[model samples]
Target: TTVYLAGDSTMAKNGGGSGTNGWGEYLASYLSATVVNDAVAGRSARSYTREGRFENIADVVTAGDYVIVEFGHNDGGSLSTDNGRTDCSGTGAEVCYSVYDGVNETILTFPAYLENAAKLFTAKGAKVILSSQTPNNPWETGTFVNSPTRFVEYAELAAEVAGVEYVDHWSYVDSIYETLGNATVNSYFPIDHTHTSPAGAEVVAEAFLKAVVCTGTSLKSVLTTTSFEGTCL
Candidate 1:
């Protein structure tokens, strides 16, 4: 069984270990197999799902396989925000949109894109799972925060409508922030809260794995380890 992952820069491969790390990169290690990661930096769900990317995935995803869809880290940028962060942020549609009906809309609304992705993959006979973006250095507040609240909003909708799976990474990180205090989270993501350090990546991977297994994903045996814990962070 293969699990195909798709998302933006925050989840994309950073090449060698030189670059920091994404939880997606390390997720396979815990899976005990090579889980394909098609994550691209700066791509939003709007572009990926609504666009032909999901169709591209449909071309590859097989029946009974799995696809983990994550977004919102980069789709939250305002119109004035830097483009560097803009692509990283999200809009509502799963795929990137230029102009729809002459209405300028950012598809950051979770129900739109997340639902679209889930429907496409599910229709193709593949299982779909959604995850909220990881926590970030909540602005100058210093405390790690899951600033893209809209992403989480969509995650809930995906779970509710699809009857598939969802991972509450934001809530987990928020607890970590409140529990460890701002200083500790600062150490994990030091420079960028959106991106995780090695330890932070591993933590996200663990939380995500927990969500998978708790939801009864068949990949559990492959990911089980002595250190694996089921409690929410």
Candidate 2:
């Protein structure tokens, strides 16, 4: 089986052996399946689609493949139509008003665009999985600060609208952070709180794999390891 990942920097491919990596890189280690790390740095759902990134992916994906869609790191940016981060509010509406292509290109909400991307892949006979945004490094009242943002809610709605699987990476990883306490968790992110160190990326990967297995996803059967202790609810 093959898994195609699409999202922002958190899951984007990075310089291997450089100590900086994304969860997608570590994910391959735990999965027997082939991983296509198509996630690019700083790209959101709208920008990825608008820039023909998905088109490239569509050309290569075949039946029985899996596509993991994650975003929100950059989607939390300014809501200016020019800014790709301008996500629509809720799954309540189909489209959010935003400018694209220097004209009246209707900008869809984060959830809206995610659903669109899922449908595009689904039409290709591939199973789509929507993942909640990974938690950034921050602590608030014994939890990762802003760990559960509106994006989590949007991810849930997008999965429902797309009729695909949803992975709660935020909560699963957050639980681990809480268990490790603030200082230990801080060690995971040597850079800034936003990005993770190599060790941290591995943990994120474990969390993702665990989620796939616990959710009864077919991909779970291929997991090389379920080392994460957190239980997926």
Candidate 3:
């Protein structure tokens, strides 16, 4: 079985050429050769799927493959960009941009991307897992201000409605935040709370790996860990 990752920059491998890499770069180190990262920086899941990149990846994914989907960090923001990444003129889902009132300035359709990607792969008999956007910038709380209580809810719902596995990355990070404190969580990203430094990246990657493997009841004993604070439910 293989686990393929398809998402935006936060998940892309850092280019060795730059001496800097993203969480996905280190994710490879945590996983065996069977896991593959198919992430592309700045490409919205909307465009990724529409452009056939996801389909092309699916062509080789085969049955029994594992696909982990994460998006939402960049999905929110001004809609002036017409690259179809921020613009939601398409027929995908995720129309809610706001929490109580007004549309969030962002396209906010990250769930749609997960649904589409999962549909494509799962139809072929593969399994799918979804994770919320890594915690937002501590400075950018306004971005999710209305949705503060629901950051992880959205991603979990993606897998829930799709009848697939869901990983609570936000909560995982939240635990880290509780342990480290907001000052420290922000320190991990420092100038940018949205992304992680290499050291922080390692922690995030491990949390993701732990969440996925530990979820299956079949993995209870072998994947056991005393670190996790709560169950995915």
Give all TM-scores, in the order shown.
0.76, 0.89, 0.73
Backbone clash numbers for all candidates listed: 27, 1, 3
What's model 3's lDDT at 53? 79
Please list the residue runs of candidate 1 whose C-alpha ends up more than 4 Å from where it truly belongs after superposition. 15-18, 79-109, 138-148, 215-222
- Pitting candidate 1 against candidate 3, the one with the higher lDDT is 1
Positional deviation of 22 in candidate 1, in angstroms?
A: 0.8
Model 1, span 1-233: residue lDDT tens? 78888887667787223456777887876666559888876677655754567778878888878888887776656544334233323333343433444555444444566776788788888888787776665533753444556667767776677777777766665655565666666666645546666776776677677665555654565674636554544
Higher-ranked by TM-score: 2 or 3: 2
Off by over 4 Å in 2: 15-19, 94-104, 140-146
lDDT of candidate 3 over 134-195, digit per residue (tens): 66544345222213434356677768777787877666655555555555555566445455
Q: For model 1, state the Cα shift of residue 73 in Å.
A: 1.2
Worst 10 residues of 2 by lDDT: 138-147
Looking at candidate 3, the ten consecutive residues that score lowest on lDDT are: 217-226
